[PDB]
Design a protein around this ligand. Structure first.
Ligand SMILES: C[C@H](O)COCC(COC[C@@H](C)O)(COC[C@@H](C)O)COC[C@@H](C)O
Ligand SMILES: Cc1cn([C@H]2C[C@H](O)[C@@H](CO)O2)c(=O)[nH]c1=O
Ligand SMILES: Cc1cn([C@H]2C[C@H](O)[C@@H](CO)O2)c(=O)[nH]c1=O
Lengths: 136, 138
């Protein structure tokens, strides 16, 4: 619900294939300080299990499909990403888990800050405690 | 002999949850990321690219499948196959490139040191060669 959006990118498609460009501050609202990507995840696996207080991210499935379970206090949605020209914006204090990674799935993440363990919330009870103060 | 190009190795975090590779600007690569783009769904018989730049620095990474990058400067050519998501191909100024043999499911990611500037996109092969001969020819 809150703090999440689907963002639509340009998709230049012709006989040479498809290309999507993303420029920091233009196609997404922040500068891209860091990217990471997740591949070769087994079909029965669920990963993620984290939130953040300060980071903004955009998640994009560049091949195959993956399901993202987004939680905030009292609220939960599952969004399937399967189109490289669509990004899932996730702002602060949303908890996420990802599952149903397909064969050959590639999940790319663009992030608004360098990695900072102090801002990675990995303990769900701590999450709930911080998040109910924001959302409730 | 092949100037202005390198293979860069990234961290590959592999565990029961799969693989993850992180790339932070100025740390894992030598520039800040102003732009990314990615290429998907390329037919197996296609060659694309055919360009160079004067000022742009890029890293190419094949996140799934395999793709061949033909790099050239005057008098020199190499073809590099990218097929590992934890390896990037850095390409500096005045290297001409083409990409081909994209496999089914291939995904090529490019990280770029500047926003798109048509004026730095050298598409004329004869102009490329002229400019590049001034740089590389002794
Ligand atoms: C079946 C079992 O493996 C599920 O693990 C639940 C769990 C979900 O965490 C956040 C949840 C969405 O609220 C454990 O949480 C229970 C109490 C402790 O918060 C996931 O376990 C965390 C591992 C997988 O890193
Ligand atoms: C590579 C790239 C191309 N383009 C446009 C300009 C090129 O003339 C066109 C190629 O079809 O795509 C962008 O708008 N942004 C980009 O990052
Ligand atoms: C998401 C991400 C994780 N990691 C690593 C660091 C943490 O110690 C590890 C989780 O144990 O994930 C990075 O190094 N960079 C990143 O961008």
């Amino acid at each position: 619900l809150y703090n999440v959006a689907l963002i639509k990118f340009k998709d230049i498609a012709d006989k040479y294939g498809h290309l999507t460009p993303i420029e920091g501050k233009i196609d997404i609202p922040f500068d891209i300080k860091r990217v990471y990507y997740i591949t070769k995840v087994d079909k029965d696996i669920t990963r993620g299990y984290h939130s953040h207080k300060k980071l903004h991210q955009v998640l994009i499935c560049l091949n195959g499909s993956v399901k993202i379970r987004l939680k905030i206090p009292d609220e939960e949605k599952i969004i399937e990403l399967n189109d490289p020209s669509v990004g899932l914006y996730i702002g602060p204090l949303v908890w996420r888990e990802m599952f149903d990674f397909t064969e050959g799935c590639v999940l790319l993440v663009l992030a608004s800050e360098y990695y900072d363990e102090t801002d990675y919330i990995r303990n769900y009870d701590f999450y709930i405690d911080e998040a109910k103060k924001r959302f409730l």
